[PDB]
């Protein structure tokens, strides 16, 4: 014992648990969730079937109304309108819209993709060429619906719904220590270590860390990219928020007024999420430690301007990972392993099935012990099994899935960059 | 069954009645054997789609019979201890105190000083006791 | 008029809960199970 100076080891980082996702404790593997989709057009399950309700699409304002009697001409690239008539178009976003023509004009003959057509139509709308319109059906038509008085081809529009579902499956993970007797004995003689228990700790720890890290990555993987579309400033850099570029800060200088610009965008992204999910404004953010340092140093309340030290929210990743609540509104977590600099926002409801992302544990941290008689060295390890999944409707773009059944597990096709509950923001310039 | 052992036919009926009473009891949600002492219990588990009682049968049969063998070794020993000096008397003295009986004394006697259906029964019970 | 439709007698589809109509099923309720009796 030549003046032993004690010893060191690394600390274990904390986790965000499942604070921002579903937890679905399971008592069996492979559970299932189903859903009802209000639908109309006399066949709940069909190509082209239309959903009665959707966060991103307007309703068919003339479905029970005049559209019952007549079809409306569709808008299409290169066609010319007739003043006073009404044209129909289903937009990629904002859905069914009926537009009365105030003028006789053409629409972007050079348009190709629907996105280009939608853009010109939007311009014609702004221009006052095309105006939103709806009306009920002339009563003289309604009078004979269902073939009265010798009439024909006059059914009422019908509605119903389609129930379908998705299922999940649990994947697992296991690790062993495979250690030796002699090492454990020496450790007992050096620090008084058990050298099995420490390993048990390490293995269990690693498993838990991986799972939690996996959830965060799935959040990032499925989240839509923000500062885009409906939340985009047209002169911006598309998905990334800077401090070195006046476009994102409305010309700000003077950090006391500049930093608030981010808070503004955060609200916009949180609101759009509600627009995407139909449930509510995002209520949680996870972000790089650099982002949080900024948040904690700016007065996030409404005031003239203000700057100081980063004391507003815990900023460490050594005690916790939970920084605090932003404005008293969003739960702020720190992405202690962020690859660059950024921040994801999202919404999780009181209903465990209302989360977008779900974790559903079935088996966890089962210890295993024994020894191999060939050399009698010990073997120890741990096993976990759970499975994760995604919300039906998380994509939101589609009103319904193929074949009335799908995996509820994430995949590229199922959710990469699609999840209505979360949005990504890249951050630079801090 | 056909009760081949006709020897105890009336006793079998007595056990059937008591057994039926237990079947009609609400003594469920019990993990414990509900036993303290006496007869040796074991998991002759049946009337369910697993039939584990077969292991229990085979255990009793295949291992016949350390329970009674041990019992013999103990009893045989007990007698052999009693055969020596002092042990001999200790037993005698205890037995004598447990049952003291002398000229015109009282024997173990049923004392029915608690409520009964009728004094007539009290006498019948004492006569049977005798 | 929306319908329930029905199973194709395909035990797989039945177990899954697939029918020809507007609504999928949870899956068949399980009535119980029978283990072959043990020889005496």
Swiss-Prot record, chain B:
GO cellular component labels: host cell plasma membrane; membrane; viral portal complex
GO terms under biological process: symbiont genome ejection through host cell envelope, contractile tail mechanism; viral genome packaging; viral release from host cell
Localization per Swiss-Prot or TrEMBL: Virion; Host cell inner membrane
Alphabetic keyword roster: Capsid protein, Coiled coil, Host cell inner membrane, Host cell membrane, Host membrane, Membrane, Viral capsid assembly, Viral contractile tail ejection system, Viral genome ejection through host cell envelope, Viral genome packaging, Viral penetration into host cytoplasm, Viral release from host cell, Virion, Virus entry into host cell
Biological role: Forms the portal vertex of the capsid. This portal plays critical roles in head assembly, genome packaging, neck/tail attachment, and genome ejection. The portal protein multimerizes as a single ring-shaped homododecamer arranged around a central channel. Binds to the terminase subunits to form the packaging machine. Attaches to the host inner membrane most likely through interaction with host yidC and forms together with chaperone gp40 an initiator complex to form the prohead.
Subunit and interaction comment: Homododecamer. Interacts with the large terminase subunit. Interacts with the major capsid protein. Interacts with the capsid vertex protein.
Record-stated family: Belongs to the Tevenvirinae portal protein family.
Name assigned to this protein: Portal protein
Organism whose genome encodes this protein: Enterobacteria phage T4
Swiss-Prot record, chain C:
Organism domain of life: Viruses
PTM note: A proteolytic cleavage by the prohead core protein protease gives rise to the mature major capsid protein during virus maturation.
Function, in words: Major capsid protein that self-associates to form hexamers, building most of the capsid in association with pentons made of the capsid vertex protein and one dodecamer of the portal protein. The major capsid protein self-associates to form 160 hexamers, building most of the T=13 laevo capsid. Folding of major capsid protein requires the assistance of two chaperones, the host chaperone groL acting with the phage encoded gp23-specific chaperone, gp31. The capsid also contains two nonessential outer capsid proteins, Hoc and Soc, which decorate the capsid surface.
Family: Belongs to the Tevenvirinae major capsid protein family.
Subunit structure: Homohexamer. Interacts with the portal protein. Interacts with the capsid vertex protein that forms pentamers. Interacts with hoc; one hoc molecule associates with each capsid hexamer. Interacts with soc; this interaction reinforces the capsid structure. A total of 960 subunits of the major capsid protein forms the 160 hexamers.
Protein name per UniProt: Major capsid protein
Organism: Enterobacteria phage T4 (Bacteriophage T4)
């Amino acid at each position: 014992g030549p003046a032993v100076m004690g010893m060191v080891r690394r600390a274990i980082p904390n986790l965000i648990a499942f604070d921002i996702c579903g937890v679905q404790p399971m008592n069996s593997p492979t559970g299932q969730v189903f859903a009802l989709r209000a639908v109309y057009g006399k066949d709940p399950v069909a190509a082209g079937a239309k959903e009665a309700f959707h966060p991103m699409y307007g309703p068919d304002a003339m479905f029970s109304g005049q559209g019952a009697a007549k079809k409306f001409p569709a808008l299409a690239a290169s066609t010319q309108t007739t003043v006073g008539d009404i044209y129909t178009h289903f937009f990629q976003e904002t859905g069914t819209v009926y537009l009365q023509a105030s003028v006789q004009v053409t629409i972007d003959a050079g348009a190709t993709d629907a996105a280009k057509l939608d853009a010109e139509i939007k311009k014609q709308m702004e221009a006052g060429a095309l105006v939103e319109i709806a009306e009920g059906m002339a009563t003289s038509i309604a009078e004979l619906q269902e073939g009265f008085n010798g009439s024909t081809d006059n059914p009422w529009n019908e509605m119903g719904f389609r129930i379908d579902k998705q299922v999940i499956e649990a994947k697992s993970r296991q690790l062993k220590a495979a250690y030796s007797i002699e090492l454990a004995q020496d450790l007992r003689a050096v620090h008084g270590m058990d050298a099995d228990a420490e390993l048990s700790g390490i293995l269990a720890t690693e498993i838990m860390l991986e799972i939690n890290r996996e959830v965060v990555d799935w959040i990032n993987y499925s989240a839509q990219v923000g500062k885009s579309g409906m939340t985009l400033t047209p002169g911006s850099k598309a998905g990334v928020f800077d401090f070195q570029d006046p476009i994102d800060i409305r010309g700000a200088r003077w950090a006391g007024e500049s930093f608030k610009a981010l808070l503004f965008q955060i609200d916009k992204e949180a609101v759009e999420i509600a627009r995407q999910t139909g449930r509510g404004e995002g209520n949680f953010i996870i972000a790089s430690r650099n982002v949080v340092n900024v948040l904690a140093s700016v007065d996030t309340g409404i005031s003239y301007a203000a700057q100081g030290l980063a004391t507003g929210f815990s900023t460490d990743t050594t005690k916790s990972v939970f920084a605090g609540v932003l404005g008293g509104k969003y739960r702020v977590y720190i992405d202690q392993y962020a690859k660059q600099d950024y921040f994801t926002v999202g919404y999780k409801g009181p209903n465990e099935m209302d989360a977008g992302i779900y974790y559903a544990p079935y088996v966890a941290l089962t210890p295993l012990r024994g020894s191999d008689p060939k050399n009698f060295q010990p073997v120890m390890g741990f096993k976990t099994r759970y499975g994760i999944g995604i919300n039906p409707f998380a994509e939101s773009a589609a009103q319904a899935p193929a074949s009335r059944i799908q995996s509820g597990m994430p995949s590229i096709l199922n959710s990469l960059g699609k999840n209505a509950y979360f949005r990504r923001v890249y951050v630079k310039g801090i | 069954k056909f009760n081949v052992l006709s020897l105890f036919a009336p006793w079998a009926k007595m056990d059937e009645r008591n057994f039926k009473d237990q079947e009609k009891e609400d003594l469920v949600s019990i993990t414990a054997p509900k036993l303290d002492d006496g007869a040796r219990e074991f998991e002759v588990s049946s009337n369910e789609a697993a039939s584990p009682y077969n292991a229990a049968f085979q255990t009793i049969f295949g291992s016949y019979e350390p329970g009674m063998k041990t019992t013999r070794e103990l009893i045989d020993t007990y007698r052999n201890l009693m055969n020596n000096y002092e042990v001999d008397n200790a037993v005698s003295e205890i037995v004598s105190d447990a049952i003291v009986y002398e000229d015109d004394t009282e024997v173990v006697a049923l004392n029915l000083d608690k409520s009964k259906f009728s004094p007539k029964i009290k006498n019948m019970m004492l006569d049977e006791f005798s | 008029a929306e319908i329930g439709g029905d199973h194709g007698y395909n035990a797989t589809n039945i177990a899954a809960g697939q029918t020809s109509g507007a609504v999928t099923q949870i899956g068949p309720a399980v009535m119980g199970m029978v283990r072959r009796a043990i020889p005496n």
